[PDB]
C-alpha cells in the first residue's frame, strides 16, 4: 500500500566515474579468445552515469529517509549495487504505471523471486519491511506492499533468489534490457572489495533467467526493504545499511564493439575522427599516413516552401455531391 514516501528531495549525488564494470555475456559456444565481431548493445565508458543515496542516514537529527525514485528507461540500463545485507528485494515497472498497462512485478523473497506481469494499481511510493523479532533471531518473512489490484494477471514464475547473502563490499550488479518480444537479464555478484567508488575490475555479468513477455516498457522503480516505523521522523532509528546501500544507474546508446584465456570483450564505435578512422579501416591499429575516411556535406539550415498566389478552392462537391454522372 501507500505509506507515501515521496521526499522533497534531499542532498544531491555526485556522478562518479564508471571504469568498465558493464560487459555481459552473449553466447554458449566453444572458442577461446577469438577477437570476435558480434553486435549487441553494451555500455559506453567514461561518460556520465548516476547513483543516488538510498537511505541517506544523517547524524544526530534528520528526517525519514526512504526516497526510492521513479525514472524513465531508455530500453536498457546497467544496474549496480554496493549493498550487502539484502535490502533490495525486487523492482517494479510500467509505462502508464497504473492499471492501464500490464506491469512488471519482479520481487525477491527469502526462498524465490516472484515474476509477474499484470496491470496493478500502483502505490506512488510503496516499501517493504525487514525487522527484528524479539523471540526468534533472524526470521525474515517479507511483507510485499507493492501490488494491490490484481486485474488480468497471467504471468507467475518461481525462481532462485537473485540477491543472496563476507566482510567487504560485494557489488551485486545487473544489466536489464528492454527489447520488444523478449526481455533480457544479465547479472553479476562480485566477491568482497573495499572501493568506495564502483569496485574495480570488469564484470562477469552472467545470465540466469529470461522473460518471454517483451511488451512496451517506459518507466522504472526499484525496491528497498526497510522496517521503517510510523512514529518519529527525527528519531527515525531504522539504522539498516547506513550509506553503503548506494545503487548505480547506467544507460545504453547504439554503439559497436569487439569481443576477445577465453573470450571476454572490447569495441567498434565512431566518436572522434580517430575512431572514425578505426571505423572505416575496421582496424584497431592504424598506421602512419593520410587516410580518406568519410565525407562532409553542408547541411540544410531551414526549409522554405514556394507556392503561387491562389486563394479559392477546387470544385470537388460539383461532381462528388452533384446530381448524376
Amino acid at each position, epitope marked *: 500500500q501507500c505509506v507515501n514516501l515521496t521526499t522533497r528531495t534531499q542532498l544531491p549525488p555526485a556522478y562518479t566515474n564508471s571504469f568498465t564494470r558493464g560487459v555481459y555475456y552473449p553466447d554458449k559456444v566453444f572458442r577461446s579468445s577469438v577477437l570476435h565481431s558480434t553486435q549487441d548493445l553494451f555500455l559506453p565508458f567514461f561518460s556520465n552515469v548516476t547513483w543516488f543515496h538510498a537511505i541517506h542516514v544523517s547524524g544526530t537529527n534528520g528526517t525519514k529517509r526512504f526516497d526510492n525514485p521513479v525514472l524513465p528507461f531508455n530500453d536498457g540500463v546497467y544496474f549496480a549495487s554496493t549493498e550487502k545485507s539484502n535490502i533490495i528485494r525486487g523492482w517494479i515497472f510500467g509505462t502508464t504505471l497504473d492499471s492501464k498497462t500490464q506491469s512488471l512485478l519482479i520481487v525477491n523473497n527469502a526462498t524465490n523471486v516472484v515474476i509477474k506481469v499484470c496491470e496493478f494499481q500502483f502505490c506512488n511510493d510503496p516499501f517493504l519491511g525487514v*525487522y527484528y*523479532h*524479539k523471540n526468534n533471531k533472524s526470521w525474515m518473512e517479507s*511483507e510485499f506492499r507493492v501490488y494491490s489490484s490484481a486485474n488480468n494477471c497471467t504471468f507467475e514464475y518461481v525462481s532462485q533468489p537473485f540477491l543472496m547473502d563476507g566482510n567487504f563490499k560485494n557489488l551485486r550488479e545487473f544489466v536489464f534490457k528492454n527489447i520488444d518480444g523478449y526481455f533480457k537479464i544479465y547479472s553479476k555478484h562480485t566477491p568482497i572489495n573495499l572501493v568506495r567508488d564502483l569496485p574495480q575490475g570488469f564484470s562477469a555479468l552472467e545470465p540466469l533467467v529470461d522473460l518471454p513477455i517483451g511488451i512496451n516498457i517506459t518507466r522504472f522503480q526499484t525496491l528497498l526493504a526497510l522496517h521503517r*516505523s*510510523y*512514529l*518519529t*521522523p527525527g*528519531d527515525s532509528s531504522s539504522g539498516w545499511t547506513a550509506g553503503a546501500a548506494a545503487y548505480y544507474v547506467g544507460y545504453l546508446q547504439p554503439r559497436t564493439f569487439l569481443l576477445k584465456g577465453t573470450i571476454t570483450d572490447a569495441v567498434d564505435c565512431a566518436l572522434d575522427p580517430l575512431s572514425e578512422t578505426k571505423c572505416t579501416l575496421k582496424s584497431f591499429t592504424v598506421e602512419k599516413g593520410i587516410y580518406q575516411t568519410s565525407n562532409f556535406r553542408v547541411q540544410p539550415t531551414e526549409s522554405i516552401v514556394r507556392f503561387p498566389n491562389i486563394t479559392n478552392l477546387c470544385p470537388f462537391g460539383e461532381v462528388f455531391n452533384a446530381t448524376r454522372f
Partner: antibody, heavy 119, light 107 residues
Framework: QVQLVESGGGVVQPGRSLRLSCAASGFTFSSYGMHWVRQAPGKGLEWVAVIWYDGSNKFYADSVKGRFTISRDNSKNTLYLQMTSLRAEDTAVYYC????????????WGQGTLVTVSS | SYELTQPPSVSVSPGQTARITCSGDALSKHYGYWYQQKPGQAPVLVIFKDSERPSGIPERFSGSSSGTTITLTVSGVQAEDEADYYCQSADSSATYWVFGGGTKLTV
C-alpha cells in the same frame, strides 16, 4: 514532561461535525507523529488514529478508517478535525499520544477531551 | 488489529503477588506492553522496551519476556495499587495498536 492540554469537548448532534482540539505542550511538533487513543467511560482503552509531521499519511484504525481527518497546521497551534457521520460510536474520553520509538510504545497521557451525543 | 488475550479480573490477597498472564503469538513481532490507568484518570507509561523504567518512576519491577508470555512490572504492594494494566503487543510495520479492555488490581 508532556501533558496534552486539550479541551473543547461539548455539544454535538449525532451525525454532526464537531471540530475538537488537541493542543500540545512540551515537545517539538514537526518531529513527532502524534497518535490518538480513545477510552469509553466503562470500557478499556483502544487506539484510533495517528498522523505524520506534515500531513503526508493519516492512518486510522481498522474499524474507523476514513471517517476522520486529523491533521495539523503550524500557525493555528491546535489539532483540528471533522468527525464525519458517526454511528453512535463517539461516546468516549479521547486522548492524544506522543510516541518516541522505543519499539512502538506510548509515553505520557494528558487529561482527556470528552465528546457526547444526546440519544 | 485483532484484540489481545487478557484476564478480566483477578482477586487475590496474601502478600505474595500473582502474575497477570498475557498470551498471544503477536508478541514475537513487536512485543507486549503495559499501560496504567491511575486514580485521577492520568495514565503513564511505567515500563518500556520490556526492560527499562524511565526517570523519576516509583520504583517497581520490570519484564523478562520468557517466550510467549511476559511477567509484569508489579513489585510488593502499597496502598496506591488500585490502578490496572493494558496489554499492548504491536505489529511490525503496518503499525496497529490494540490495548484491550484491561485488567483490575484490587486487594
Amino acid at each position: 514532561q508532556v501533558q496534552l492540554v486539550e479541551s473543547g469537548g461539548g455539544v454535538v448532534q449525532p451525525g454532526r461535525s464537531l471540530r475538537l482540539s488537541c493542543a500540545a505542550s512540551g515537545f517539538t511538533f514537526s518531529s513527532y507523529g502524534m497518535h490518538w487513543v480513545r477510552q469509553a467511560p466503562g470500557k478499556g482503552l483502544e487506539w484510533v488514529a495517528v498522523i505524520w509531521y506534515d500531513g503526508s499519511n493519516k492512518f486510522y484504525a481498522d474499524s474507523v478508517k476514513g471517517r476522520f481527518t486529523i491533521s495539523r497546521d503550524n500557525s493555528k497551534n491546535t489539532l483540528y478535525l471533522q468527525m464525519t457521520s458517526l454511528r453512535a460510536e463517539d461516546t468516549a474520553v479521547y486522548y492524544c499520544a506522543r510516541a518516541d520509538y522505543g519499539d512502538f510504545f506510548f509515553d505520557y497521557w494528558g487529561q482527556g477531551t470528552l465528546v457526547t451525543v444526546s440519544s | 488489529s485483532y484484540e489481545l488475550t487478557q484476564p478480566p479480573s483477578v482477586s487475590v490477597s496474601p502478600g505474595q503477588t500473582a502474575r497477570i498472564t498475557c498470551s498471544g503469538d503477536a508478541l514475537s513481532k513487536h512485543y507486549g506492553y503495559w499501560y496504567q490507568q491511575k486514580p485521577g484518570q492520568a495514565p503513564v507509561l511505567v515500563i518500556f522496551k520490556d526492560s527499562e523504567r524511565p526517570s523519576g518512576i516509583p520504583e517497581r519491577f520490570s519484564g523478562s519476556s520468557s517466550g510467549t508470555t511476559i511477567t509484569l512490572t508489579v513489585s510488593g504492594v502499597q496502598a496506591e495499587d488500585e490502578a490496572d494494566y493494558y496489554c499492548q503487543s504491536a505489529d511490525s510495520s503496518a503499525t496497529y495498536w490494540v490495548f484491550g479492555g484491561g485488567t483490575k488490581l484490587t486487594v
